[PDB]
Structure 1
Amino acid sequence: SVVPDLKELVSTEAQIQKMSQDLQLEALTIQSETQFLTGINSQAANDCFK
């Protein structure tokens, strides 16, 4: 109830996108799309923080 909410974050989309460029996601490895359920960060961080 107290822990101040955060502000000025990096656009969700922007980062995750440079992320795929860097991440080399789908490169053989079978167990895809489990590292990107990361999203809702604009939230997740606030939650993780509090």
Structure 2
Amino acid sequence: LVSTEAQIQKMSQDLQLEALTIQSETQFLTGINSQAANDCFKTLIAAMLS
């Protein structure tokens, strides 16, 4: 997989996260680890079979 920080940094510079103002865009970084990716990958396929 791609490293989390190496991609998140691109994402972060694309979003231009201002400090003062409140934004809906911080919440987009919620739950971006692996081991959930694998969790979904293992849940979906098993579900489609079952």
Instruction: Give the Å deviation of 1:25.
Output: 2.3
2:36 is aligned to 44
Structure with greater proportional helix content: 2
Query: Within 1, Cα distance between the matches of 2:19 and 2:13?
Result: 12
Q: Which has the larger radius of gyration?
A: 2
Bigger Cα displacement from structure 2, 20-29 vs 31-40: 31-40
- Where in structure 2 are there 5+ consecutive unaligned residues? 43-50
Distance 2:16 2:25 in 1: 12
Q: Residues 40 and 22 of structure 1: is their aligned pair in 2 closer, same or farther, counting only changes over 3 Å?
A: closer
TM-score (norm 1): 0.51
Structure 1 residue runs without a partner (length 5+): 1-8
Q: CA RMSD in A?
A: 2.9
Number of aligned positions between the proteins: 42
Kindly report structure 1 stretches of 4+ aligned residues shifted beyond 3 Å: 31-34
Cα deviation per residue 1:2-46 (whole Å; 9 max; x = unaligned)?
A: xxxxxxx10011000111111222365425674255345222211
Q: Which has the higher contact order (CA 8 A, sep 6+)?
A: 1
